Structure formats: structure tokens, C-alpha cells
Protein: Beta-lactamase II
Amino acid sequence: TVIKNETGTISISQLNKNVWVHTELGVPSNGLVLNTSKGLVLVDSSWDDKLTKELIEMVEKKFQKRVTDVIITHAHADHIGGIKTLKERGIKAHSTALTAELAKKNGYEEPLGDLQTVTNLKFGNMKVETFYPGKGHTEDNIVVWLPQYNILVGGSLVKSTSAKDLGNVADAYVNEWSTSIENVLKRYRNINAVVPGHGEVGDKGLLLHTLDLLK
Ligand SMILES: [Zn+2]
Structure:
């Protein structure tokens, strides 16, 4: 089930009953929409305020619920870009402290900086674990794990199956990135789906593919 806006710039696709992938064109970028009994939780918002607001309005219309929380997976403009929108709408913008520090450094309003290396959140019955595996795509990048579904949100740490390019490495720790991905692999022994920063949802093979690119 894939639903879109009128421009086609924003789409949401159901992964399972309560888990949807949101995709926006800024180049596409993925995150998750989690439909919980206590509102909507996003893993990542969008590139900027306009798209972030459109995204929120879309999902809030679709599920007739408040977006309560967003997990920000790193501090780059294309991840922190809708922070003003989140804060004005009373959306809790979770991030690690490092991501918050970097967001400020980039001139952005600060997300919460509440996430620790391992943070388990629960929204109604929806369980969410955030994990900082070490530096890779950026110094601060985290992954998100849905232990009820064994779904891993790789974000920019994980490239898609067709991707031959690691993307922006100006802020990357290319050598460390392999170790960080290994940390994710060691941590989650049974992964089902993995959501890359952009491109189609895959499986653990995406982590391997990314290691291959990094070699
Ligand atoms: Zn980035």
C-alpha cells in the first residue's frame, strides 16, 4: 500500500500493520511512520520545514492522530532541516546529545539530545530502540531498531542495493564506518528488514553491501 501527495514528492508505504515508510524527494530520503495507540512517531522527518510540515500533515490526516515524537538519526541539514516545524507543533525531536550539538553548530534549533547510546522508547505498544553504533556517515549517526518486527532503520549509514556511492563523505568517518556497521550486525543477530537512508527496503544484505562499498 503506497499513498502519495499531489506533486509525488511525498509518499508513504506500509511495511506492516503499524509501520510505514515515508519517502520524500529533496533525491529521495526514507524514514518511518509508526502508527501507535498514543499517536504517530516518525523515524526522521524531512529535508526542510515545508516538506516536514507536509509530511506531518499527510500522516496526521491519514491516521487522524498527532505526531508526538520524531527520532532524528543525524544532524545534517537533510535530517534536522524540519526541526523548526517539529518544535512549533510540540513534536518531541529525539536525538543524541552529539546530534543536538552538531545541529546547533549547523545553526539549527536544537533537538532534545536525550538519546543515549542505547535508548529504548515505547509508544503505546510500539517498541523502538535507538542505537549509536559509532561514527560512519557522520560522527553522530544512529540506527533505530523495532524489536517487535526486527526492522532496522539504517538511515544514511546504510546504502541501498543499487547504490554504488556512499554519498557525502565530507563529514564521514569512512574507516570507522565499517566498524560501526559491524557493531550493528553484532548487536542485532536476527534482522528482518533494513531501511536504507534512501532506496528500497531490504534486509541484512544491505549492511553487507554497504561494507562492500566501504572496502
Ligand atoms: Zn547526512
Remarks:
- The longest helix spans residues 49-63.
- Helices lie at 49-63, 77-80, 83-88, 97-105, 174-187, 205-214.
- The longest strand covers residues 28-36.
